[PDB]
């Protein structure tokens, strides 16, 4: 879909494999989703494996981090 071309290389950026890629692709997240809405909760629906979601939530969480502490 238009711009996932950015959530695609960020994904592959955290280690993402093309199976996973597809996965997320196909329920139409956006980058904006994955560092602004999605819970944990989210990523273990997707049926994430261990380490993308742990680097995944870590990079998300760092971002999150960032906003709010820049307020």
């Known amino acids: 879909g238009p ?5 695609i290389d960020w994904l ?6 093309a199976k996973t890629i ?3 692709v196909e ?3 956006t980058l904006s989703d994955i560092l602004n ?4 909760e989210d990523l273990r629906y997707l049926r994430l494996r261990g380490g ?7 990079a ?3 971002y999150r981090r960032a906003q709010e502490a820049s307020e």
Do not use: P
Request: net charge negative.
């Open 37 to 40: 809405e999605i819970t944990k």
């Open 60 to 62: 998300v969480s760092q």
């Open 52 to 58: 993308l979601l742990c680097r995944l939530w870590s």
């Open 3 to 7: 711009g996932d071309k950015e959530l």
């Open 12 to 17: 592959r950026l955290q280690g993402a494999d």
């Open 22 to 24: 597809e996965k997320i």
């Open 27 to 29: 329920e139409g997240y």
